[PDB]
Paper text:
The protein exists as a homotetramer, with each 902 amino acid-long protomer organized in three distinct functional domains. Remarkably, the tetrameric state of [name] is indispensable for catalysis because the intermediate domain transfers formyl between the catalytic domains of different protomers.
To elucidate the potential effect of NADP+ on the structural organization of [name], we also prepared cryo-EM grids after adding 1 mM NADP+ to the full-length protein. Single-particle analysis of the new dataset containing 202,398 particles produced a 2.9-Å resolution map. The arrangement of the Ct core and Int domains in this structure was identical to that in the ligand-free protein and corresponded well to the configuration of the Ct and Int modules revealed by NS-EM. A small difference was observed in the NADP+-binding site, where the C-terminal end of the helix formed by residues 652–666 was better ordered in the presence of the coenzyme. Instead, the Int domain of chain A was docked at the substrate entrance tunnel of the Ct domain of chain C, whereas the Int domain of chain C was paired to the Ct domain of chain A. Therefore, each Int domain of [name] is paired to a Ct domain of the opposite dimer. The 4′-PP group covalently linked to serine 354 of the Int domain was found in the fully extended conformation, penetrating deep into the substrate entrance tunnel of the Ct domain and making multiple contacts with residues forming the tunnel.
Author numbering:
A (entry chain D), D (entry chain A): 313 to 397, 405 to 902
B (entry chain C): 452 to 752
C (entry chain C): 828 to 902
The structure:
């Protein structure tokens, strides 16, 4: 396209001379002549870049651009361009920093508005007031996202590059997130209402650990070579190959905006897929900030797509769309059942569910009390109640029942309530207004049946959406609070007789759910026995809320199926081809 | 005549399966002990291999020479294979982040799910039963098999051999009948935790739908396909003709991985088809018990 | 590849470059090369897009019938 | 070779007619015409066998015979032979049975005498008298064994058959051993002096479990397909294949004649190797009986080879021989070092060692005493002392030291001593005379230094080689008995202060060896902490002597390297090829 000057032709002829030397036979280097089709090794690509850099002083050339421009005309044209030849933020000053939050959609590595410039407000639960407006996605926008994702997979650069190359980009993404860790943590505190000290450790911290972990797996996903029956006297050879499925449609909950995004997205990209994320409506801002960092990290455009909006509009369309092959979900049972039904009707697509549960926590007499009280509170009141593996029920032994509850009340009084940005704060405000309303009805319905309210169980006189840490005692199995999940800072305590292991297990296991469980004991025989009998995904022993990115995580009966985190996570996003030879 | 199952009978089967899992001997014994019983089952099937092969020829209409190799043969190989796995299903010990200065230890355990409800197609009565049942029992589960209505007799003969092999009572349960009556109930039943299926797409979609509504149970599908077969000029023709016919006409057409389409190159197109017609004329048609027979009668009317 | 299904496929060729190239591009579960109808109990078996999901036969067949508990200690 | 009659030609022409029908094109069937080269499938082999069985009434034909005789003349000749066409034992009547023991060498599936008909006597330690004479191997005999093994591997049937076929033969071997389990157990009682009730459970029992376990692995040894860097724009494919090494030369100890043979041989044959076993001179009879059963099981001739004789003559030659590629060994450090030295000088062959150790056993106060006494004795006095993972030292806490020792002495008095065939017997006679002599010197040297002899420590007044169960107390770390291994029924007890975990670990770990260890405690924190700090291969918690064929087994520092049993065992006997393509 671009016309050459007198000096540029002298450079072009010097490049033409190099091509003759580098390539083996090469009768004549015309414009049509391709570099690799002639017969160029991977060593020859390095020799080319170095030889061109000797001619032109500077010229920041790399091996990647050689693979792009294979032909001679394409190479020279590209080389001439090197020689001769904005994101709308919302500013806000808090926590000795100046935040810059994107508020638009993200389709094909570009921040763009929705159809008709439709928007919705996002709330700050600390004060109660609005922070900014965010773009509301439509059905037309979903079509563009899935189209962009499919192009990035098939024809795009993401598919072409090596497994080791994909891993480097995912590791570089984590380093960018590490630099903006204080910035992301502050946005969580405004958006979700999470405490700042906790947000660095849990919300932002694990997110960084997730992308670093699954980056390592990229070039360690091996198939097999099977010793099958040889058709004597002829020979046979069978082997397996793990491949990507294609496009994926993730839908995340509101309890952990950034962390739940990371858990699913990191594993999906590691396998080698393109993604269309759908964040929660209450908390979209963390996801849009993450989309900004993918450009800096240097992810190809189209790979990551984000559409903030309503679940019934956007989420339902992804299920119905035939191009999408995989639906990740973490939320409630009723909503989860609807996705699996839509998955079957659409195009028999794959699905993995992660539903809520009513996790028990047995506490025997032989265990030390001071640690049991600490970890007892840390099960219930971790992340202002909102935790998917929160202690639903606490079974305490008769001998240490009265002593246990007395110590809990003392510590609950000491707990600080205030602004989450302040370092002195322990307990923070609830995520959104609609959630707070149900927690009031929960505690009201608890007292009706006849559960002894020790402390709390009502809203705090304060501007915002704060709630008092609550404790219930003398709770039977038949009650509503025993069965139904609170999903808030409410401790539910129960009694069981001395020296009765089999009976308490029957009460604990008597539930349709089974996500997590716990037990505190010094005796080794109890610990190992109880761990076997407890029908749950994740059992804890003398601890609680101790997950790892390496360790797998998932439910049993009515807490979904499949696994997040660990090696098992990758198996969901991969598919196995089986090649067979005969010779 | 064969007994037609009802809704009342399904309840008894699932009840018997649950008792065998929880309170029964199947759960209590070791993994190595379960593997021995599954290996002993295969040796019993090997003794009655000529008997099972003859029943296939009457019931399904399969050729006798093929039935020994494929239908009955692979069934024996299946139970021998998955018997070995029983005491080789290992978890892991994960190097997680230690809460310094305190220590931590994480480990995984692979366990059975519980009761399973298998539904098999009619193309391979005994083989498709073996593929799913063997793997299910190897993990350490109790099963409620539902055979095809057209071909129930192979499954009922298999149930006789479990008593001889010495499988605890309640583990294996078989209910010959209609798919809409029996198959639909297994999906709806809350005690069942897993539904194996191999058949058509329309029918397969209905099970996954019912699985979601019931009790978010697990499911694995194996549906039909239209498999291509490309044939280039550079390949040797005589072998290509043999394996070309052997893709299509294997097991009298009825094969889930049958060659749907054959793409042949222009240079050897006319030559290929000419050789196929010659060999198709030579193919014998008759009674499947006769050894001379190559092609047999279709499964049902 | 223009089909909603994808359970199995095949190819006959002497040239090694074609065999390995075609095997990659064919969107199917089980690819055969200079053979057909050659399954094994050890080798896995299953579909891709609209031929179901999961696997029968092999080590992968056990995973669907098993469930993973995760025990965690502190000391 | 064989001439045809008038009726045989009518059969031959009927077979000729079948070949025309079965094979696709086949212009004319002549004597030279091969079955498979024409283009015969695996289905066609079944059609042939059935069609021939229709003609001839009876005729027990199988598919294996068709693979042997591929040509038409070879098939017809073989078929005509089917239509038309001793082991020297030593009888002995004991235990309501009539034993039949081979006493010769075993080279190429044939019992044969040695060069010059040289022999040596084998002793019965119960009585003291001789039972029979056994053939003494020479250097000439070793050459024949290795030659037979190499032919069986390369040109023999063992290599040609499938992995699944090898597994069936190994499983059939176990079923034959199960039928002759009472017979093998009785030979152990005469040869080794092992108790009959123990021999069924341990010696013969685990041997059967070993061959059943490794039979399953045969067709489950998978390689990999590695996602390597693609030389863009060209493609690449890498895969691994696990293969056999070749010939192996196993040398077993005398403590467990049949069990140690099974552990190594089963894993070696499972990988797909040929073996040359060398049993201990004191106990050869169990190995020679095992060789008889391989013929019944139907193992190809040349696979298993056995050469009873001296270690310095036979064992040294196997190391020097260049055809041998692998040396398995279990014994002492002195002898073990010599093999690894000879392995390097010969032809840099592979080696895995399993040497003796001085295993500690810590006993805290919090543990229950009655169980600790049972498992305390069961560590030391299991299999009449002779156990490679025997408790070398017992560290007991001060609070329960006096109480523990008092209970041990009471139970040691109750222990029965007599003939091993008698069911009432608990403790049996020592393996051989030379072993008994060292155990007397051991206890004599113990009293010299100043160790309080509680009971025992001398020979029993009885015909045979019996020895009294011994107990030592007040033993320091500097003493000889503390450091050196007894390898006999001698309990060594020591003291350590209350509430001192770090100190007792320093004393326990202070040793060059590290094969096994143990700890008894109710407290879970101690159990998990002590298990980490104990420098040993196999740690037991509230148990002892609990090995499994699935669980791996091997030493650390100066107890050899590599593993026996489990999946890790196979890796030693296999080698990894790495094929790489470009397209
Ligand atoms: O637990 P849950 O909270 O009720 O829902 C979890 C997530 O799923 C979305 N959702 C709700 N209904 C849905 C549907 N029918 N299909 C797909 N996604 C849905 C929600 O989006 P919204 O929070 O935007 O409804 C939310 O982000
Ligand atoms: O050949 P197909 O049609 O692919 O069906 C395969 C198998 O599924 C059964 N089936 C048919 N409809 C069903 C339903 N709605 N739910 C569960 N199973 C069903 C059939 O039983 P039947 O052959 O007994 O209908 C058959 O054995
Ligand atoms: O009890 P040990 O002494 O630990 O020896 C263990 C085994 O190795 C043999 N052995 C002894 N010296 C050897 C050498 N130099 N090379 C190879 N093997 C040897 C012994 O055979 P012998 O018991 O026949 O010496 C014995 O069966
Ligand atoms: S929906 C699942 C929610 N996730 C969690 O509960 C996991 C959060 N826990 C952690 O990140 C760490 O275990 C904490 C408690 C923050 C710190 O542990 P520390 O021992 O390193
Ligand atoms: S629904 C899947 C149906 N199964 C099959 O098509 C597999 C049947 N094939 C075989 O049993 C062998 O592959 C045969 C055809 C007998 C060839 O074996 P030979 O080469 O030892
Ligand atoms: S040189 C290695 C020595 N091996 C052993 O000590 C292993 C022998 N132990 C066993 O066979 C079982 O562990 C016994 C002692 C019989 C207990 O089994 P039980 O608890 O089923």
């Amino acid at each position: 396209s671009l016309e050459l000057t007198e000096a540029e032709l002298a450079t072009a002829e010097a490049v033409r001379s190099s091509w003759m030397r580098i390539l083996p036979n090469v009768p004549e280097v015309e414009d049509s002549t391709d570099f690799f089709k002639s017969g160029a090794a991977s060593v020859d690509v390095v020799r080319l870049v170095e030889e061109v850099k000797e001619l032109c002083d500077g010229l920041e050339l790399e091996n990647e651009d050689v693979y792009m421009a294979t032909t001679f005309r394409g190479f020279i044209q590209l080389l001439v361009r090197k020689l001769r030849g904005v994101i709308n933020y919302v500013e806000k000053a808090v926590n000795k920093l100046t935040l810059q939050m994107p508020y638009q959609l993200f389709i094909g590595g570009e921040f763009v508005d929705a159809e008709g410039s439709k928007t919705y407000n996002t709330i700050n639960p600390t004060d109660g007031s609005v922070i900014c407006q965010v773009s509301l996605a439509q059905v037309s926008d979903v079509d563009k996202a899935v189209a962009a994702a499919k192009e990035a997979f098939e024809n795009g650069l993401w598919g072409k590059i090596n497994a080791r190359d994909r891993g480097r980009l995912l590791y570089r993404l984590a380093d960018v997130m590490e630099q903006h860790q204080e910035e992301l943590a502050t946005i969580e505190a405004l958006d979700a209402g999470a405490v700042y000290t906790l947000a660095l450790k849990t919300h932002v911290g694990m997110s960084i650990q997730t992308f670093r972990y699954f980056a390592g797996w990229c070039d360690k996903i091996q198939g097999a070579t099977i010793p099958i029956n040889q058709a004597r006297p002829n020979r046979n050879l069978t082997l397996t190959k793990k491949e990507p499925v294609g496009v994926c449609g993730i839908v995340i909950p509101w309890n952990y905006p950034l962390m739940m995004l990371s858990w699913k997205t990191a594993a999906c990209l590691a396998a080698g897929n393109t993604v269309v994320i759908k964040p929660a409506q209450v908390t979209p801002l963390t996801a849009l900030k993450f989309a900004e960092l993918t450009l800096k990290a240097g992810i190809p455009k189209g790979v990551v797509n984000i559409l903030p909006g309503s679940g019934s509009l956007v989420g339902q369309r992804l299920s119905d769309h035939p191009d999408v092959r995989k639906i990740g979900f973490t939320g409630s049972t009723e909503v989860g059942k609807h996705i699996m039904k839509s998955c079957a009707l659409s195009n028999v697509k794959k699905v993995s569910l992660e539903l809520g549960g009513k996790s028990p926590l047995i506490i025997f007499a032989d265990c030390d009390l001071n640690k049991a009280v600490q970890m007892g509170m840390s099960s219930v009141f971790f992340n202002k109640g909102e935790n998917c593996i929160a202690a639903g029920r606490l079974f305490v032994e008769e001998s240490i029942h009265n002593q246990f509850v007395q110590k809990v009340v003392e510590e609950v009084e000491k707990m600080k309530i205030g602004n989450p940005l302040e370092r002195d704060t322990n307990h923070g405000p609830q995520n959104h207004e609609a959630h707070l309303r149900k927690l009031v009805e929960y505690c009201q319905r608890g007292v009706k049946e006849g559960a002894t309210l020790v402390c709390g169980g009502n809203q705090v006189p304060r501007p915002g959406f704060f709630f008092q840490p609550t404790v219930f005692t003398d709770v039977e199995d038949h009650m509503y609070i025993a069965k139904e999940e609170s999903f808030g800072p409410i401790m539910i305590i129960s009694r069981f007789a001395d020296g009765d292991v089999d009976a308490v297990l029957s009460r604990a296991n008597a539930t349709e759910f089974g996500l997590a469980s716990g037990v505190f004991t010094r005796d080794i025989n109890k610990a190992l026995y109880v761990s076997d009998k407890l029908q749950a995904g994740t059992v804890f022993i003398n601890t609680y809320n101790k997950t790892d990115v390496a360790a797998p995580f998932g439910g049993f009966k009515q807490s979904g199926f499949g696994k997040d985190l660990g090696e098992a996570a990758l198996n969901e996003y991969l598919r196995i081809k089986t090649v067979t030879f005969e010779y």
